[PDB]
Amino acid sequence: MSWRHIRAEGLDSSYTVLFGKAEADEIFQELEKEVEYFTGALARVQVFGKWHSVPRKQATYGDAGLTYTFSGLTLSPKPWIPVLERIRDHVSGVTGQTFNFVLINRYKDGSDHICEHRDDERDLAPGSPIASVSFGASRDFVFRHKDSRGKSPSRRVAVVRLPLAHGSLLMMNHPTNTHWYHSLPVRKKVLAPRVNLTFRKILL
DNA sequence: CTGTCATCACTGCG
DNA sequence: TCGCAGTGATGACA
């Protein structure tokens, strides 16, 4: 296997194609059958005083007895299902990193997206990495430095762009989520779904 | 309880 | 098609 080291000021991530095509295809099929996504209130978000649907489907799974915060609410993730344990075990076996929680984001096509944000959701263990595993359609991913955002940014730190491919792993290491925001921009020419899994080590 | 800070995705452009 | 500029109610935190 080959790893691409992604490096910039305050940015430390690693990228590899972790699952081969055949295995990644099988995993994607099973995820599409089995993952149960949020409906109702959890699929709505208020932004600048206006209510919208979250522009992607979401779900959480994790170890028994864990709780987390999802927009002002204390929730329990769903118990692990085998396909998720399979993915987690391969990531852990390869990297030596351990996780007890996963957030799943499903992008139905290129019109589903996520805006600039940090995973400084800190139900997280201090300094622990997040493993971002992708299945389905390739989608463009963008890292932007915290001081390079908006109309008149204080600094002009170069944007880091890469596509996240089917079966890929992007390890995001501290302090990436302190100094950088990431996003998945709208790509209208993408017609196929993508499932992204971000494995995390959350506090007990 | 109070005040500062970060936050999320859309519309309406260009 | 892409992406910038402008839009605030709400929770975390000390």
Could you tell me which of A140, A199, A175 has the C-alpha nearest to residue A12? A175
Find out whether A153 and A128 touch, Cβ atoms under 8 Å: no
Cβ(A3)–Cβ(A16) below 8 Å = yes
The dihedral sign for the CA sequence A12, A8, A19, A24: positive
Cα torsion A100, A178, A165, A37: sign: positive
Helix, strand, or coil here: A73? coil
CA Rg value for chain A: 16
Q: Which nucleotide is nearest to A142 (CA to C1')?
A: C3
Pairing of strands A11-17, A78-79: unpaired
Q: What is the DSSP string of A38-70?
A: --GGGGEEEETTEEEE-SSEEEEEE-TT--EES
- Strand C–CB A189 distance below 7 A: yes
Instruction: Note whether A174 and A129 are within 8 A (CB).
Output: yes
Give the CATH number, domain containing residue A194. 2.60.120.590
Strand B contact set, beta carbon < 7 A: A 45, 47-48, 50, 52-55, 113-115, 117-118, 120
Peptide bond into A126 cis (omega under 30): no
The H or E element containing residue A74 is: strand A74-75
User: What DSSP element (H or E) covers A91?
Assistant: helix A82-95
- Domain of A194 in residue numbering reads as 1-204
Q: How far are the Cα atoms of A17, A70, A122, A127 from residue A66, in angstroms, in the given order?
A: 30, 13, 14, 19
CA distance A122 to A120: 5
- Number of domains, chain A: 1
